[PDB]
Write an enzyme that holds these catalytic residues in place. Structure first.
Site: not given
Ligand SMILES: CC(C)C[C@H](NP(=O)(O)CNC(=O)OCc1ccccc1)C(=O)NCCC(C)(C)C
Ligand SMILES: [Zn+2]
Ligand SMILES: [Ca+2]
Ligand SMILES: [Ca+2]
Ligand SMILES: [Ca+2]
Ligand SMILES: [Ca+2]
Length: 316
Positions: A142, A146, A157, A231
């Site tokens: 995942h 990205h 995003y 999400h």
């Molecule tokens: C596959 C899972 C385990 C992880 C997954 N992580 P993700 O890569 O989507 C989180 N990324 C994120 O929030 O981006 C924001 C971001 C933007 C630009 C630079 C750095 C960060 C997720 O669904 N995170 C959300 C988790 C929550 C908050 C719903 C518990």
């Molecule tokens: Zn993600």
């Protein structure tokens, strides 16, 4: 670093033994030279300054508790690299064998993982909501996906484009999990989510509503939390992808499944040829239909099934 390629052995987050590609020069480093221009894994040491230090080990054995998240981040990045190269003829996230960098032990009690624009970053979790997140192959894939998205479609995003961005990461996370073929499923994060609760997961692609995520466009979130629900609304696209692959009848609309491999081909082509930074769900449908048309022909079952699946989730 400059050194000679070596093979270490260790234990991942879930206690499983695996071999890892390392590099020897005084220490053994988590640097895999066998893939592209390398896969590099770093220790963030419970802090938030990135990347931290390239992971160094005295003996090429990685069986300490502290080692486990590093072992899995490193190993699963390799599996993900192999998936993209072998299945899609894509060389790393940029298509030109960019070095893949990950940091583990990020912050304290950190219940998330992310791509920061340049590298993957994994929390250890707080032991209640998550254990160290690199323990999930779907999670690692995942995150790396990205990077693929950012180098290709560039989906912004937030709102619908951001929900597509999320779904693309869940879809390919799941396809990589199937590629490795160890306890594969259409759930997201089950291996590292809520150690005190069996049988759950962070999201479900097969039934997003089981965790409160929408499975139809009429149930989409339109507020501002979570970047406009990236999400959350990903459930609508995750469900469509699940239906394309596996089939089903959803809100009375029947979809003929065409299997994982064809799902992957269709979505990879959509991501890399058709989607743009501002694509919305309707535009994703059009991109998927066109991709399936390119690959299988306008009169194909594959095209018909893509249309059925988007119909089933209310996306025209
Ligand atoms: C596959 C899972 C385990 C992880 C997954 N992580 P993700 O890569 O989507 C989180 N990324 C994120 O929030 O981006 C924001 C971001 C933007 C630009 C630079 C750095 C960060 C997720 O669904 N995170 C959300 C988790 C929550 C908050 C719903 C518990
Ligand atoms: Zn993600
Ligand atoms: Ca050691
Ligand atoms: Ca699984
Ligand atoms: Ca899974
Ligand atoms: Ca659990």
């Amino acid at each position: 670093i400059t050194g000679t390629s070596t093979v270490g052995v260790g234990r991942g987050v879930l206690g499983d033994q695996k071999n890892i590609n390392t590099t020897y020069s005084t220490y053994y480093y988590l640097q895999d030279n066998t893939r592209g221009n390398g896969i590099f894994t770093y220790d963030a040491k419970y802090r938030t300054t990135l990347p931290g230090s390239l992971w160094a080990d005295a003996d090429n054995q990685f069986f300490a508790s502290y080692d486990a998240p590093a072992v899995d981040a490193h190993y699963y990045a390799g599996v993900t690299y192999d998936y993209y190269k072998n299945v899609h003829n894509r060389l790393s996230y940029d298509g030109n064998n960019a070095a893949i960098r990950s940091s583990v032990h990020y912050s304290q009690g950190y219940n998330n993982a992310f791509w920061n624009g340049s590298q993957m970053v994994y929390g250890d979790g707080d032991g209640q909501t998550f254990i160290p997140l690199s323990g999930g192959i779907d999670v690692v894939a995942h995150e790396l996906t990205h990077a693929v998205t950012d180098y290709t479609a560039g989906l912004i995003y937030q709102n619908e484009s951001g929900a597509i961005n999320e779904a693309i990461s869940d879809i390919f996370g799941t396809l990589v999990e199937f590629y490795a073929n160890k306890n594969p499923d259409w759930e997201i994060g089950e291996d590292v989510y809520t150690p005190g609760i069996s049988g759950d997961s962070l999201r479900s692609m097969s039934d997003p509503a089981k965790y409160g995520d929408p499975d139809h466009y009429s149930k989409r979130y339109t507020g501002t939390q979570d970047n406009g629900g990236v999400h959350i609304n990903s459930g609508i696209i995750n469900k469509a992808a699940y239906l394309i692959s596996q089939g089903g009848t959803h809100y009375g609309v029947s979809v003929v499944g065409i299997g994982r491999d064809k799902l992957g081909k269709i979505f990879y082509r959509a991501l890399t040829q058709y989607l743009t930074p501002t694509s919305n769900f309707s535009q994703l449908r059009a991109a998927a239909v066109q991709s399936a048309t390119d690959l299988y022909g306008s009169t194909s079952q594959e095209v018909a099934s893509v249309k059925q699946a988007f119909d089933a989730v209310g996306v025209k």
